[model samples]
Target: TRINLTLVSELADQHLMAEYRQLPRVFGAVRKHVANGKRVRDFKISPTFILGAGHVTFFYDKLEFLRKRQIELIAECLKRGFNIKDTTVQDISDIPQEFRGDYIPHEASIAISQARLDEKIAQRPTWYKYYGKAIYA
Candidate 1:
């Protein structure tokens, strides 16, 4: 187990993971993850560090880290000036050079995708059919 944790400590965080862990901020989710065979010591929450235990101890609000990560790539896309729809998951994933640690890729994609849809929609002719408008779902 230590060997796996050692390797995971080095490489698992190199790629963003989502379904491997979900809503980890909740006690049930955290407990369920442990029950499923995920080692607490192998988990890295954020900022690129290791731990011998689970759960976030660095912040009072556990979800803040998740929120920060989800917005990371979306914020970067604002400066890229490219049609985000044209970019692949890995393309956008690599743009944020200063991200703290691994985060859920799906969450980041949805945010960036939503931003892209609005950008394309903003140029639509308002008097005819499409109009510049805020988007939400």
Candidate 2:
């Protein structure tokens, strides 16, 4: 685990430096992309040119190091034999679970509800119009 931590931290620093080095290239790419969007047609502007900045900014956000770094950390934890689960903690603003100081109540209730919902969805796909067919669900 200590070895893993050392490698992970080093990779994180490398990623940051890479980001700094290529930052100008990204700006140039976005600039050229915006101009390309404009140059494709005459007179009436292409909407892509208008939104090119936002698109490039969003793409940059996606490529930024921290996002992928966190994912790598989770994978490393799993490799180290940690039993991992994703959960959302919400208030009674909905409805809800049981006991233990170490355990989370809302997460348990959500998990239980999710299981029941899954079973019901399996039985009747039509009941869940969007979630039933969504790949992300």
Candidate 3:
């Protein structure tokens, strides 16, 4: 039997955001891809290159030192002719370009919640496995 499901975009986004909110100053990005007439959904956490604020601050409060370490690491990698991925660039870019290095834990939480909701919408149309069966539950 074939089943038709109606996907609500807003709810998906909410769910995605909620999941990431628990982490530090972090966010997620959801993308929809169509292949062979089939739609696929994928998600990625934001500021991907760097650790979340909660992690870097509350857990590792020595972020100032850590940031310096990170820069050194990146430089080392580049000197070795290592190719950086776009996701990594985007993640690092988010730090200064998007968030301006502001580490507001509460705001990050809220933003993540919203991102989750948006992700849900993007994933709704895709088929997924539930429990041990292939179903959209």
The lDDT leader among the candidates is: 2
TM-score of each: 0.22, 0.22, 0.22
> By TM-score, is 2 or 3 better?
3
Q: Please, what are the lDDT tens digits per residue for candidate 1 over residues 81-135?
A: 3233422122222212222233333454445434433353355534222112222
Identify the runs in model 3 with alpha carbons over 4 angstroms from their true place. Answer: 1-59, 86-137
As for model 3, its CA RMSD to the true structure in angstroms is: 17.7
Candidate 3 structure quality by residue, lDDT tens digits, 15-38: 222222322222211111122232
Q: How accurate is candidate 1 locally (lDDT)?
A: 0.31
Best by the TM-score measure = 3
